[PDB]
Design an enzyme around this catalytic site. Structure first.
Site, PDB file in Angstrom:
ATOM      1  N   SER A   1       4.257   3.038   8.082  1.00  0.00           N
ATOM      2  CA  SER A   1       3.874   1.807   7.358  1.00  0.00           C
ATOM      3  C   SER A   1       4.943   1.444   6.317  1.00  0.00           C
ATOM      4  O   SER A   1       5.691   2.304   5.826  1.00  0.00           O
ATOM      5  CB  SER A   1       2.391   1.861   6.870  1.00  0.00           C
ATOM      6  OG  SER A   1       2.250   2.880   5.967  1.00  0.00           O
TER       7      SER A   1
ATOM      8  N   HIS B   1       0.839  -1.229   0.000  1.00  0.00           N
ATOM      9  CA  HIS B   1       0.000   0.000   0.000  1.00  0.00           C
ATOM     10  C   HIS B   1       0.864   1.265   0.000  1.00  0.00           C
ATOM     11  O   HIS B   1       0.353   2.327  -0.330  1.00  0.00           O
ATOM     12  CB  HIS B   1      -0.985   0.016   1.180  1.00  0.00           C
ATOM     13  CG  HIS B   1      -0.405   0.509   2.455  1.00  0.00           C
ATOM     14  ND1 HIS B   1       0.006  -0.345   3.461  1.00  0.00           N
ATOM     15  CD2 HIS B   1      -0.087   1.761   2.864  1.00  0.00           C
ATOM     16  CE1 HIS B   1       0.549   0.376   4.428  1.00  0.00           C
ATOM     17  NE2 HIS B   1       0.540   1.660   4.079  1.00  0.00           N
TER      18      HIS B   1
ATOM     19  N   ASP C   1      -0.311  -7.468   2.325  1.00  0.00           N
ATOM     20  CA  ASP C   1       0.255  -6.101   2.147  1.00  0.00           C
ATOM     21  C   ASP C   1       1.787  -6.210   2.085  1.00  0.00           C
ATOM     22  O   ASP C   1       2.436  -5.957   3.086  1.00  0.00           O
ATOM     23  CB  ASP C   1      -0.262  -5.199   3.273  1.00  0.00           C
ATOM     24  CG  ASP C   1      -0.015  -3.726   3.009  1.00  0.00           C
ATOM     25  OD1 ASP C   1       0.404  -3.382   1.856  1.00  0.00           O
ATOM     26  OD2 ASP C   1      -0.287  -2.922   3.936  1.00  0.00           O
TER      27      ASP C   1
HETATM   28  C1  LIG Z   1      -9.066   2.121   8.739  1.00  0.00           C
HETATM   29  C2  LIG Z   1      -7.582   2.043   8.782  1.00  0.00           C
HETATM   30  C3  LIG Z   1      -7.026   2.748   7.570  1.00  0.00           C
HETATM   31  C4  LIG Z   1      -7.102   2.088   6.333  1.00  0.00           C
HETATM   32  N1  LIG Z   1      -7.599   0.749   6.265  1.00  0.00           N
HETATM   33  C5  LIG Z   1      -6.698  -0.397   6.463  1.00  0.00           C
HETATM   34  C6  LIG Z   1      -7.663  -1.560   6.534  1.00  0.00           C
HETATM   35  C7  LIG Z   1      -8.749  -1.135   5.557  1.00  0.00           C
HETATM   36  O1  LIG Z   1      -8.383  -1.503   4.237  1.00  0.00           O
HETATM   37  C8  LIG Z   1      -8.749   0.375   5.651  1.00  0.00           C
HETATM   38  O2  LIG Z   1      -9.596   1.135   5.246  1.00  0.00           O
HETATM   39  C9  LIG Z   1      -6.644   2.703   5.188  1.00  0.00           C
HETATM   40  C10 LIG Z   1      -6.108   3.980   5.264  1.00  0.00           C
HETATM   41  C11 LIG Z   1      -6.081   4.684   6.455  1.00  0.00           C
HETATM   42  C12 LIG Z   1      -6.531   4.073   7.618  1.00  0.00           C
HETATM   43  S1  LIG Z   1      -6.392   5.078   9.070  1.00  0.00           S
HETATM   44  O3  LIG Z   1      -6.305   6.428   8.573  1.00  0.00           O
HETATM   45  O4  LIG Z   1      -7.416   4.723  10.008  1.00  0.00           O
HETATM   46  N2  LIG Z   1      -4.979   4.704   9.833  1.00  0.00           N
HETATM   47  C13 LIG Z   1      -3.685   5.044   9.228  1.00  0.00           C
HETATM   48  C14 LIG Z   1      -2.654   5.542  10.236  1.00  0.00           C
HETATM   49  N3  LIG Z   1      -2.217   4.492  11.152  1.00  0.00           N
HETATM   50  C15 LIG Z   1      -1.205   3.670  10.851  1.00  0.00           C
HETATM   51  O5  LIG Z   1      -0.542   3.818   9.829  1.00  0.00           O
HETATM   52  C16 LIG Z   1      -0.903   2.544  11.752  1.00  0.00           C
HETATM   53  C17 LIG Z   1      -1.318   2.267  13.035  1.00  0.00           C
HETATM   54  C18 LIG Z   1      -0.761   1.093  13.548  1.00  0.00           C
HETATM   55  C19 LIG Z   1      -0.083   0.382  12.567  1.00  0.00           C
HETATM   56 CL1  LIG Z   1       0.730  -1.122  12.712  1.00  0.00          CL
HETATM   57  S2  LIG Z   1       0.059   1.295  11.119  1.00  0.00           S
HETATM   58  C20 LIG Z   1      -3.193   3.806   8.508  1.00  0.00           C
HETATM   59  O6  LIG Z   1      -3.482   2.645   8.814  1.00  0.00           O
HETATM   60  O7  LIG Z   1      -2.395   4.142   7.522  1.00  0.00           O
HETATM   61  C21 LIG Z   1      -1.637   3.021   6.973  1.00  0.00           C
HETATM   62  C22 LIG Z   1      -2.419   2.490   5.795  1.00  0.00           C
HETATM   63  C23 LIG Z   1      -2.514   3.533   4.730  1.00  0.00           C
HETATM   64  N4  LIG Z   1      -2.082   4.783   4.854  1.00  0.00           N
HETATM   65  C24 LIG Z   1      -2.392   5.417   3.658  1.00  0.00           C
HETATM   66  C25 LIG Z   1      -2.944   4.532   2.793  1.00  0.00           C
HETATM   67  N5  LIG Z   1      -3.076   3.331   3.471  1.00  0.00           N
HETATM   68  C26 LIG Z   1      -3.635   2.114   2.888  1.00  0.00           C
END
Ligand SMILES: CCc1c(N2CC[C@H](O)C2=O)cccc1S(=O)(=O)N[C@@H](CNC(=O)c1ccc(Cl)s1)C(=O)OCCc1nccn1C
Ligand SMILES: *[C@@H]1O[C@H](CO)[C@@H](O)[C@H](O)[C@H]1NC(C)=O
Lengths: 27, 250, 11
Positions: B198, B43, B99
């Protein structure tokens, strides 16, 4: 063959400040 | 990283920064697995819902870093990408299942005090260490909270969580290609990865052979360091057949 | 703004 061994730690037999926290959890 | 600390010099010599040429900026972490191969999250390169689809020429890899923003002359090495390889069953549509991506560098990077590869786990090391309560270590230059940026690489140690506790924390479907890590709500310790961490590594130090193994890839979480939520990591051992097929072929 | 300019050879 040399993977996972850090020049400034394992290769010198020095420990970082928190690696013992990991070892202690491997119960 | 939320509620982490400053990395020590050379503490994570496999840590890689994925860097956008375009607007010059941090995209993701990554890890060095040999002199020519870097492991990250799919991602970080491809995420259609946010119109992300990077090509090789968009990106650099910065290896041996400690400072987030400084050009670390004589320490860091900056590498061009020859080729991106994304898992063919990476599921960006639903839950980031599988991923994982590899990047082949144009030229081999020279190893140093600051630059050295992490090991990938074999079945035996995975079976031994991926147990609820065992701690791993997560590193990166991402946000210090959900809603500052660090001067230097941050580190936090976090315990692996029981699969049912991981599933019960979220509405998202959790697969066997994922594991979760973090402290429970009133444990007295907290911490998490966050935005910009990430693609970086979740590593564990084998007590059998005193080597570091990359058991996970920082994948996603709901927010960062929320009470009752956990961080989700790509299960590197489960996808090692694909990793081996890409490196053997290319 | 943020990042230090990297040598012009890497770009
Ligand atoms: C709902 C969670 C989520 C999703 N997800 C994933 C499952 C489902 O497909 C969905 O929709 C997608 C985007 C955003 C978010 S979010 O904004 O709630 N959280 C962020 C910030 N936290 C963290 O990075 C972490 C915290 C602990 C660890 Cl370990 S990583 C995040 O997960 O970004 C990383 C992923 C990412 N960033 C930009 C693009 N992508 C894909
Ligand atoms: C991503 O980009 C490549 C090259 O431009 C293209 O072939 C591919 O279809 C794109 N993928 C998605 C899912 O948009």
């Amino acid at each position: 063959a040399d993977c996972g061994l850090r020049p400034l730690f394992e290769k010198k037999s020095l420990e970082d400040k928190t690696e013992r926290e990991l070892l202690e959890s491997y119960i | 990283i939320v509620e982490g600390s400053d990395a020590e010099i050379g503490m994570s010599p496999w840590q890689v920064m994925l860097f956008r040429k375009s607007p010059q900026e941090l995209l993701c972490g990554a890890s060095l697995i040999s002199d020519r191969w870097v492991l990250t999250a799919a991602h970080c390169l491809l995420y259609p819902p946010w119109d992300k689809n990077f090509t090789e020429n968009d990106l650099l890899v910065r290896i041996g870093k400690h400072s987030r923003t400084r050009y670390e002359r004589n320490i860091e090495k900056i590498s061009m990408l020859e080729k991106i390889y994304i898992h063919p069953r990476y599921n960006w549509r639903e839950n980031l299942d599988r991923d994982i991506a590899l990047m082949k560098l144009k030229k081999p990077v020279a190893f140093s005090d600051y630059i050295h590869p992490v090991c990938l786990p074999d079945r035996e090391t995975a079976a031994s260490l991926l147990q609820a309560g065992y701690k791993g270590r997560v590193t990166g230059w991402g946000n210090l909270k959900e809603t500052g940026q660090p001067s230097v690489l941050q580190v936090v140690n976090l315990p692996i969580v029981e699969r049912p506790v991981c599933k019960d924390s979220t509405r998202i479907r959790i697969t066997d290609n994922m594991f979760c890590a973090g402290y429970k709500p009133d444990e007295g310790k907290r911490g998490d990865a966050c935005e910009g961490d990430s693609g970086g590594p979740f590593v564990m130090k084998s007590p059998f052979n005193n080597r570091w193994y990359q058991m996970g890839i920082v994948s996603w979480g709901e927010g960062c360091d929320r009470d009752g939520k956990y961080g989700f990591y790509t299960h590197v051992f489960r996808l090692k057949k694909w990793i081996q097929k890409v490196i053997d072929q290319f | 703004g943020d990042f230090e300019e990297i040598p012009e050879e890497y770009l």
